[PDB]
C-alpha cells in the first residue's frame, strides 16, 4: 500500500530519519529496504539520484533476517563497501539503523529513499524523495496512522472507485473495482483468482476490458448490487461478463439477487440497451441462483446463462463472437 510523501516523512521524522521542512546539498545517495520471505534487504549506494539508473553494480546489499537486526557496526562496514569512508560511513550506518527501526516497527513492505542528500559543511542529511509502502492490513495496531493508502502503481482513485473501497470496509465480504480507460467488455466476476483469469481471457483473444471487478467472501446482496450498478454505468458497454468459478461458501442465490436488482436499476436509467449479459456460475444454491438470473430474459435483458458444464472463461469467446 503506497503512501504519499507527506505521511511517509511523518513516519521518518518519528524514527529520527532526517527529512526536509515540509535544501542546497553536495551529494546524493541511494538507500532502500525491501521486504522478503526471510525479512528484508537493505540496498546502499554512493551514486544516488538520476545516476543510480546506470550504476547498479555500485549497490551493496545485505539481507536483514527477520527480528535479527544488524549492529551500527555491521551497517557502517557495509557503508564502506559502498564507497563511503569516515563520518559519511558513520552517519549513513546510523540512518540505516533508524530506517530498519522504521521498517520493522511501522509494518512496512518497502522504503525507498532516492536521493538521500548530504550537506557536507554541517553534515546535514535529508531524505529528498520518500517512496513508502506499508502493510495497511496492520492499521488496527497503528493508532498514529492518520492517512489512507494511494494507488500502488496507477493513477489516483476515481469517483466510482473510491465509493467501492468505502462500501468494502462496511461488510465481512470483499468488493473491488478498477476503471480501465475505454474498453468494451465489463467484468462482474466472483473471486480474485477467477476475475484475473477472465481479464486474461479477454486480452488473450484480442478484446478490450472496460474494467476490473471482483466480489468474494459471501458479500451481502447490496454490496454486489452497488458493484453491478457501477459496472453498468461504464463507457461503450456492449458486453457484461457475470462469471465466477464454483463458490465454496458464497451463496449464489443471495449474490445473484443483488446482481438482478443492480441490472434492473441500470436498464431503467437507459444503460443496458443492446448489452448482452453472459452468466456462468457455480457454488452453494447455484440451481436457484442460475434459474432466477435466466428469468431476466422473460422481461428485458439479452441474457445467456450457463452452468459448470460451460468451461469457466469460455463465455468470453461466445461474447466476443456474438
Amino acid at each position: 500500500a503506497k503512501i504519499l510523501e507527506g505521511p511517509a516523512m511523518k513516519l521518518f521524522n518519528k524514527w529520527g530519519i532526517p527529512v526536509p521542512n515540509y535544501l542546497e546539498h553536495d551529494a546524493e545517495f541511494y538507500v532502500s529496504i525491501i521486504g522478503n520471505k526471510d525479512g528484508a534487504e537493505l540496498l546502499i549506494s554512493k551514486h544516488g539520484g538520476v545516476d543510480i539508473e546506470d550504476n547498479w553494480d555500485s549497490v551493496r546489499r545485505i539481507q536483514i533476517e527477520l527480528d535479527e537486526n544488524p549492529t551500527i557496526e555491521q551497517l557502517t562496514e557495509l557503508a564502506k563497501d559502498a564507497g563511503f569512508e569516515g563520518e559519511i560511513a558513520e552517519r549513513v550506518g546510523k540512518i540505516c539503523s533508524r530506517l530498519i527501526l522504521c521498517f520493522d516497527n511501522e509494518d512496512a513492505q518497502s522504503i525507498e529513499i532516492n536521493p538521500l542528500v548530504i550537506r557536507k559543511s554541517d553534515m546535514r542529511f535529508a531524505a529528498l524523495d520518500a517512496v513508502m509502502n506499508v502493510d495497511y492490513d496492520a492499521r488496527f495496531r497503528h493508532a498514529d496512522w492518520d492517512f489512507k493508502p494511494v494507488s500502488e502503481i496507477g493513477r489516483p482513485f476515481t469517483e466510482a472507485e473510491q465509493q467501492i473501497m468505502e462500501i468494502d470496509s462496511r461488510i465481512k465480504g470483499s468488493v473491488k473495482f478498477v476503471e480501465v480507460p475505454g474498453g468494451e467488455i465489463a467484468l462482474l466476476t466472483a473471486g480474485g483468482g477467477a476475475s484475473v483469469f477472465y481479464a486474461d481471457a479477454v486480452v488473450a483473444r484480442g478484446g478490450t476490458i472496460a474494467n476490473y471487478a471482483e466480489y468474494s467472501g459471501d458479500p451481502a446482496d447490496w454490496a454486489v448490487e452497488a458493484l453491478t450498478e457501477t459496472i453498468c454505468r461504464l463507457p461503450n458497454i456492449k458486453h457484461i461478463i457475470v462469471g465466477g468459478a464454483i463458490a465454496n461458501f458464497t451463496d449464489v442465490k443471495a449474490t445473484f439477487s443483488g446482481i438482478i436488482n443492480g441490472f434492473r436499476e441500470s436498464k431503467s436509467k437507459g444503460y443496458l440497451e443492446g448489452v448482452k449479459i453472459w452468466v456462468r456460475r457455480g457454488g452453494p444454491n447455484e440451481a436457484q441462483g442460475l434459474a432466477a438470473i435466466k428469468q431476466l430474459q422473460e422481461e428485458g435483458f439479452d441474457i445467456h446463462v450457463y452452468d459448470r458444464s460451460m468451461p469457466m472463461t469460455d463465455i468470453v469467446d461466445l461474447a466476443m463472437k456474438s
Partner: protein
Amino acid sequence: SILANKDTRAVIIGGVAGVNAAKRMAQFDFLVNRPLTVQAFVYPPEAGQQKEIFRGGELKNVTVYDSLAPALEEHPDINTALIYLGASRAAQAAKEALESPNIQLVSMITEGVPEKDAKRLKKLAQKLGKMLNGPSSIGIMSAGECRLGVIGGEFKNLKLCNLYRQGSFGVLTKSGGLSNEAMWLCAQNGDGITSAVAIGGDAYPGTDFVTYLEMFEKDPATKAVVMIGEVGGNLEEEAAEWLAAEPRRIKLIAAIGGTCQEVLKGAGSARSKMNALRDAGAYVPDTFGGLSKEIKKVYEELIAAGEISTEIDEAVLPELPPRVQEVMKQGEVIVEPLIRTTISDDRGEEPRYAGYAASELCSKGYGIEDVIGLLWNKKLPTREESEIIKRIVMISADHGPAVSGAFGSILAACAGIDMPQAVSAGMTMIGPRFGGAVTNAGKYFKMAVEDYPNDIPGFLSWMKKNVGPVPGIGHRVKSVKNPDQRVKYLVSYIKNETSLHTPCLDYALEVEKVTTAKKGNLILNVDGTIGCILMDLDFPVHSLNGFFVLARTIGMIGHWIDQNNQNSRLIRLYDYLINYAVKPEQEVPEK
C-alpha cells in the same frame, strides 16, 4: 492424498465461521463414511457450550473450550488446527497451535493478517518442523479421506467432483474459488483429485508450491499436479526450478493469471512464469480454457502408460437426509402433532379468531365482548349475549384490595415483581373460595333444576352430604343486611331488560331465600349469579370461570399499577396480626 487423511483430527479455533466450516466438514465426513474430523472448538466467548453439528442425519455435540490446553487435554487425538479468528487474534492463535506438541498442521483462513505476522509464523513452523497453510487459505481437501475447511462447497458439488474417492490429480492454487474450479476440471477431464491445497493469496504463504510438489512427488496416488498461480512474487519460478532440477515422476499442469500487461522490471510477470514452467517441462495452456485440454492430455497419457485404471464409478453414494418439513410437504413421513388447536390461526397476515380476521372485526364495529365469544365459544355473539358479557366483565372487574387475588397482586407489586408475574400470583388465588365457583355454580344449579325442580331442601341435603358448601352461595362481607348491588344489578338487567328465560338463575334465587333464612351471609354471590346467567345462555361449561378470571385481571393489573405509582415498600405482615401457636422451644438432641 498429502496433508489431510483419515487420521486427521481437528480443533477449530474461531466462532460462527468456524462452526460453519465444521458443518461442511461433517457433510464430507458423512459422504466418505468416516468419524467427525472436528473434535473440539476453542472460543472463549462461548466456552463451556456445545455446538450441534449434523453428520448426515445424526446430531453430534462438539464442546467449546476457553483455550487450546484444555481442548488437547480432553482430546489428545487432535493433530490439526484450523484458525477462523479475525486478523487481530489469528496470528497469536496460530502461534499457540504451532507450539502445541500434538499439532502437526495449522491452516489459517483469516484475511488481513499482517505480513510481519505471517513471516514470523512461517519461521516458527520451520524451527518446529511443522506445516503452516495460509493465511487466506480456504482449506485442504483429500478426496475420500478428509476435508479441512469449506473447500469443495455444497454437498451436490462433492458428488459432481467425485470427492468421495481418490483420483490421480493433485491441485495447488493461491485462489480459493479456483481450487474448486480445478477439482471440477479434474473430475470432468480426468479421474478426479488426490488432494487439493489452497496455499493462500497473501504475499507470504506459510508453505510455498515446491514444499507441496515435493509431498505430491512422494504420494504414489498423485500422478500429475494442476498448479494455478498468479502474477506477483516468486513461488511459481521456484516450482519451475524444482521441476527442471531432476527427472520428476509427477507431471505439472500450470495456469498463471495476470497476462494483463496492458494495465499499470517485471520479474514476477505471468508470461515469465509461463515461460519458466514451459521450459522446465510443465503443461502450460495459453488461456484457462486450455487447462481442461491439458488435463485430458495427461489423463489419456497416463492410461496409455498404464498408470491409471479405467474403473467406472460403480458406487452407491449416501444422500443428505432432508429436513423433517421437506419430507412432510411431500407426505413421505408421518409426524404426529404435539398439540391440536381449533380456536385461532396466526399463520396468515393477521390472526383469525374462529375463522374471522381480527382487524376485520375492529373495522366492522365489534368489541372486546365479541372477541371473548369467538375465542371461547367459536361463535360470534348475539347483541343480547354481547350486552350480558360486557356487563359481567365490567361488574366483576374489581372488588377492592382486601380480596385474595387483588391482595396477591399487591403483595407481588410491593415485592418488586413485574406485572405479568405479579398478576399471575393473584390469579392463582381464583378457585373454590374466591371467584372460581362460577363453573360449579352453573353445574349444580343446572342439576338442581333437572333433579330437584320443586325440592330445594332435597338439593341442599344432597349438596351438604356430597359437595359441602353450595358453590355460588355465601360472602364474607355481603349479607341480607348489606346487599351486593352487583348481583341485584345483573338480575334486574336480565329480568327487566331482556325477555330471557333463566331457569338456573330462578332456582338459585329461590335457594338464596332458604339459605339466608339459615345465616344472613348465605346470599347468592357474583360467582353464582354469573354461573347461572351463563348456563342459561348455554355457554360451554368449561368457559364459565373465564369471565371472572378475565374481569378480575383488570382489577389485579389496576392494583399492580397503583402500588407501583405509589412506590410502595415490601409488605411484611405485622407481628400483632399473627397467632404464633408454635411448639415450646427445645434443645436439639445429639445424634
